[PDB]
Amino acid sequence: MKVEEILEKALELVIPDEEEVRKGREAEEELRRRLDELGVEYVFVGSYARNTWLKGSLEIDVFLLFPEEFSKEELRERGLEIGKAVLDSYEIRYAEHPYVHGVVKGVEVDVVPCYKLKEPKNIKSAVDRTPFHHKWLEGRIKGKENEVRLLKGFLKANGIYGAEYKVRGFSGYLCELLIVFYGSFLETVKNARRWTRRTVIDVAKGEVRKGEEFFVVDPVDEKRNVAANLSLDNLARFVHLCREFMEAPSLGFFKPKHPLEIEPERLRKIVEERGTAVFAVKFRKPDIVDDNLYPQLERASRKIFEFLERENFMPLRSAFKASEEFCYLLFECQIKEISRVFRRMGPQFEDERNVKKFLSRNRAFRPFIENGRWWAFEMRKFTTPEEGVRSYASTHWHTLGKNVGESIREYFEIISGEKLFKEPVTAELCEMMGVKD
RNA sequence: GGCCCGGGGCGGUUCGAUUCCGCCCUGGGCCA
C-alpha cells in the first residue's frame, strides 16, 4: 500500500504495550528505592531511560558514578557489592571491565560502574562516555521515541541491528543519532538511499559531507565514529533495503524472516545442478565470547578461502556457523578436481644465469620455451579442494585465529557430500548459494 | 583476550622476494 499506512500498522510491532511498559515502570521504581536505601549515586541511562527500546527488549541500564580519583579496582569491588545487594539474582559479566547484571521484579538489569566526570576528554573507558551520550541525547530525542523504534524494528528484522561483531550492524546510539539528524524513520530511510561508502554524517555540525569512509561523528567526540563497526556490506544492504522499502512499502520489512528449514533432499539436488564442490571444516568451538569467536571465524574462513583461490580451486564463497558444541567453516568451489601437472613461469631466455638454475632442478617432464621465457611442468601435492584444506589447515592451524586456530590443531575434519547436509549447516549453505524459496 | 590497520628486528617456497606462504616487538582503531 502507501508508506504512511504501513508505518502506522508497523508501530504495533515495535512499540511496547501498556503491560511491558508498566512491568518496566514498577521494576524501574523498585530499583531506585533499593539504590537510595543505600544512598548510592546512580543514573539510569540507555534505551530504557529515554523510552526508545524495541518492543520485547526491556532492560534497565544503571550507571554508578564514582569520583574520578577512585581506583579501577575500587570501582569494581564496590560496583559488585552494590549490584549484589540490589539485584534479586545477579551474575557477573564482562566487556573491557567487569559489571553486574541480573533481574528485579522480573526485568533485565545492568549495573555498570563508571567515573562521574566533567569534560568528555577526561574519559578513560567506554562506560565513561555513556553518561555523556545520554546527556546529549535526552533533550534532543524527546517526542521521537517512536521513530527510533521503527528504525530499530526495521534493522533487527533484516538482521543488522546490533553493533557487536556477530552482526556488524547499527548500535542503538547510532539509531538515535540518525533520528535526531533526519527527524523521523521515513526521512532516514529516504536519505539513506543516497548514502555511499564515503559518506560522513556529522550531527553536531548538522552536516553531510564526502569523506574517507562511512563516518557518523559522535556529537560528544568528533574523533569517535559511531558506525565504526558497521561493515561495508551491511551498509550496502541497508541502502538497498531503503530503496526497496520506498519503492514497494511493505509491513513485511519489520517482520523477521522465516528460517525456512529446506528439505535436505532438495539441497543435494541443487548442489548437483551446480556441479561444484561443497565442503566444511569442522572443529570444536573454543570456549570464548562471541565477540572473540566471530572475528576469528571470519579470519579462518577468509584465510582458507584465499588458500583456495591461489591454489586454483576457484572458490565461489565462504561462510561459517557456530553452534554450542562445534563450529563449521563452509566453502563452495568451482573445481572438484584439477590435474596434477601445472605450469610455472621461469626466467627469460636472455640471462643464462637464471635459466641455468631454473633448468637445473630435478623435474619429471622437460621444460620448454614459450613467447621468449622458459616454463616448466610440475606436479601438485594435492588435486581436490578438500585435499588442499586438509593439508593447509593441518599445517597452518596457527594463523587462523588464536583460539580458533588452537582448536583446529588438536582436532578438525572435512565433511562433504551427503554427510554434510546432515550437519546443522543447511540454512547457511542455502544462504551462501543464493538458493531461493 | 581477541580482530582489524599502520610501522620496525628472522625462516620455508621460488631462477629470482621487502614484495608469495608463515613464525618471534612498536603505535592506532573496533566489540567498548
Curated annotation (Swiss-Prot):
InterPro entries: CAA_C (IPR048833), CCA-adding_arc (IPR008229), CCA_tRNA_nucleotrans_2 (IPR042090), NT_2-5OAS_ClassI-CCAase (IPR006116), NT_sf (IPR043519), NuclTrfase_I-like_C (IPR011068), Polymerase_NTP_transf_dom (IPR002934), tRNA_NucTransf2 (IPR015329). GO terms for molecular function: ATP binding; CCA tRNA nucleotidyltransferase activity; CCACCA tRNA nucleotidyltransferase activity; magnesium ion binding; tRNA binding. Keywords: ATP-binding, Magnesium, Metal-binding, Nucleotide-binding, Nucleotidyltransferase, RNA repair, RNA-binding, Transferase, tRNA processing. SUPFAM superfamilies: Nucleotidyltransferase (SSF81301), PAP/Archaeal CCA-adding enzyme, C-terminal domain (SSF55003), PAP/OAS1 substrate-binding domain (SSF81631). CTP binds at residues 47, 50, 133, 152, 161. Pfam families: CAA_C, NTP_transf_2, tRNA_NucTransf2. Transmembrane segments: none annotated. It is an enzyme of class 2 (transferase). The keyword Nucleotidyltransferase applies. Changing residue 133 to A: No decrease in both AMP and CMP incorporation. Its EC number is 2.7.7.72. Its cofactor is Mg(2+). GO terms for biological process: RNA repair; tRNA 3'-terminal CCA addition; tRNA surveillance. Changing residue 50 to A: High decrease in both AMP and CMP incorporation. ATP binds at residues 47, 50, 133, 152, 161. Mg(2+) binds at residues 59, 61, 110. The keyword Transferase applies. It catalyses: a tRNA precursor + 2 CTP + ATP = a tRNA with a 3' CCA end + 3 diphosphate; a tRNA with a 3' CCA end + 2 CTP + ATP = a tRNA with a 3' CCACCA end + 3 diphosphate. A single active site specifically recognizes both ATP and CTP and is responsible for their addition. In contrast to the eubacterial homologs, the specificity of the nucleotide-binding pocket is determined by both the enzyme and the tRNA. Homodimer. This is CCA-adding enzyme. It comes from Archaeoglobus fulgidus (strain ATCC 49558 / DSM 4304 / JCM 9628 / NBRC 100126 / VC-16). The gene is cca.
